[PDB]
Design a protein around this ligand. Structure first.
Ligand SMILES: Nc1ncnc2c1ncn2[C@@H]1O[C@H](COP(=O)(O)OP(N)(=O)O)[C@@H](O)[C@H]1O
Ligand SMILES: *[C@@H]1[C@@H](C(=O)OC(C)(C)C)C(=O)CC[C@]1(Cc1ccccc1)C(=O)OC
Length: 340
């Protein structure tokens, strides 16, 4: 049993030469060599079974990634856990080895317009796939857009994903759509477009555009740039208590995107504006985003696959005890066990 920084990594003998990459709130990620397939991999050690929401996120991510197959969405190559459910305290998810992520990349490099356009197209190509499966990612941010040595971008971390139906503690809420700060329900695919626009804006300036300390401070950032909501924009707010609060704010002028990002490609700022619209109904959808003139050179519907069939969780996870969720995780991973 190899160890890394004092953590047991019980992935041998198929995976060896483990190197530390980083950590989450309940796991450690290493790179490793897969001796069977003769390829370099990432292995995420997950230890969720003492916490019910960790068990939700683990089940969600396993269920959605196993079902997804797209070039811009991280896959699961293999899963290692113990042969009996009493013995399983850890799940190891094997994935494709990635170099870095867009959070790290933006810390050290300023992206030219060509690279911003290349990255945005890949984000939207993958998102087009996710949404066509009737799934919301719900947590798009720079830190979980991974890049590999080929400079290929892959969306990851679907632990907060939900199946869309229009009729949870997060690290950073800076990419959250305004309607999530305002309402408690009714989240549509629109919330992912907002996040993608928040990421576009960050690639244009190497600083986040709406970095509030809490929900009220986050909203003042949004309105301090978008300007005050229009009359029609206030009507689309569902929660009257929240809608009433926006009316009490003093009027704020809309800062033109040309002034925030004086040096951005005009075609990009136009698309940013259609992604950072306040009204979720008027916000641009993922196909229209892909067809936008900023991505003319990459747009290619014939090379932008979609999901075979809409996702259906087949069960809701919100009320299940963590012992039930461990049972569901054990079942979901049986297919990677020899002899299933
Ligand atoms: N498939 C992968 N390849 C390379 N590195 C990976 C990876 N999956 C996660 N990582 C890395 O491990 C750390 C992320 O751990 P993780 O739990 O999955 O995501 P996070 N940052 O939302 O907490 C990050 O440094 C991330 O770049
Ligand atoms: C790839 C990208 C990058 O960091 O790649 C890794 C492999 C993660 C270091 C960039 O920042 C910029 C675009 C990138 C590299 C590149 C290629 C050609 C000319 C300039 C930069 C890329 O698009 O390569 C496919």
């Amino acid at each position: 049993p190899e160890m890394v920084r004092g953590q047991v990594f019980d992935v041998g003998p198929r995976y060896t030469n483990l190197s530390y990459i980083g950590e989450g709130a309940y796991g450690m990620v290493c790179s490793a060599y897969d001796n069977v397939n003769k390829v370099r991999v990432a292995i995420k050690k997950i230890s969720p079974f003492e916490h019910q929401t960790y068990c939700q996120r683990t089940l969600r991510e396993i269920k959605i990634l196993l079902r997804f197959r797209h070039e811009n969405i991280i896959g699961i190559n293999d899963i290692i856990r113990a042969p009996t459910i009493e013995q399983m305290k850890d799940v190891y998810i094997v994935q494709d080895l990635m170099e870095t992520d867009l959070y790290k990349l933006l810390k050290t490099q300023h992206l030219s317009n060509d690279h911003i356009c290349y990255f945005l197209y890949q984000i939207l190509r993958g998102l087009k796939y996710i949404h066509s499966a009737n799934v919301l990612h719900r947590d798009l941010k720079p830190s979980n857009l991974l890049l590999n040595t080929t400079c290929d971008l892959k969306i990851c971390d679907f632990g907060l994903a939900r199946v869309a139906d229009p009729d949870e503690y997060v690290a950073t809420r800076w990419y959250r759509a305004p309607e999530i700060m305002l309402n408690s329900k009714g989240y549509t695919k629109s919330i992912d477009i907002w996040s993608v626009g928040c990421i576009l804006a960050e690639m244009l300036s190497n600083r986040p555009i709406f970095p509030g300390k809490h929900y009220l401070d986050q909203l003042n950032h949004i309105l301090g740039i978008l300007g005050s909501p229009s009359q029609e924009d206030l009507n689309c707010i569902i929660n009257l208590k929240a809608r009433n609060y926006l009316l009490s704010l003093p009027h704020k002028n809309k800062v033109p995107w040309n002034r925030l990002f004086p040096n951005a490609d005009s075609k990009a700022l136009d698309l940013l504006d259609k992604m950072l619209t306040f009204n979720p109904h008027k916000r641009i959808e993922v196909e229209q985003a892909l067809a936008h003139p900023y991505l003319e050179q990459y747009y290619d519907p014939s090379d932008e696959p979609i999901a075979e069939a809409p996702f259906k969780f087949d069960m809701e996870l919100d009320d299940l005890p963590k012992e039930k969720l461990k049972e569901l995780i054990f079942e979901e991973t049986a297919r990677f066990q020899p002899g299933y």
